[PDB]
Ligand SMILES: O[C@H](c1ccccc1)[C@H]1CCCN1c1ncnc2[nH]ccc12
């Protein structure tokens with residue numbers, strides 16, 4: 520039993536809810552919140568900008584030190600950093616940004632990072648401003664993640680389409 524509330528169950532291990540991931544994180548304080556990161560951990564917009572704003576820029580400060588030490592992530596890769604005031608940990612995961620020409624096949628590799636954590640709150644990778652089809656992203660999620668994932672979809676109109684079209 521966990522404290523996630525109001526999710527629709529899609530499969531044995533995947534759940535979904537129309538919700539602002541920032542507001543969800545502040546309520547649940549999950550062990551792991553997933554950020555829709557880029558390789559530079561520059562949290563400018565989308566989910567990343569919103570999560571960072573909610574940490575009063577502490578996420579960005581920590582991220583800049585991470586990059587200075589380690590260099591950029593790989594597309595499809597991840598790192599674990601602090602969750603600050605939102606969660607115990609933040610798993611920064613880089614899905615391909617179609618608007619940069621990045622290989623959509625890397626979306627499965629990106630979701631594989633979730634399997635290193637038993638329970639996660641997360642957005643649909645590569646969706647929104649990353650330019651991929653959110654319906655496709657949900658399919659890859661369900662077919663790749665085996666751990667328990669609670670998906671927050673910000674756009675209510677998009678949420679309804681994802682549910683109604685889910686196979
Ligand atoms: O799939 C969502 C989406 C939202 C709008 C249009 C298309 C897709 C992702 C991708 C872009 C942002 N987003 C979010 N998801 C959950 N919580 C969020 N808080 C702030 C942003 C955000």
Ligand SMILES: [Cl-]
Pocket residue numbers: 555564565566567646647648649
């Ligand atoms: Cl985003």
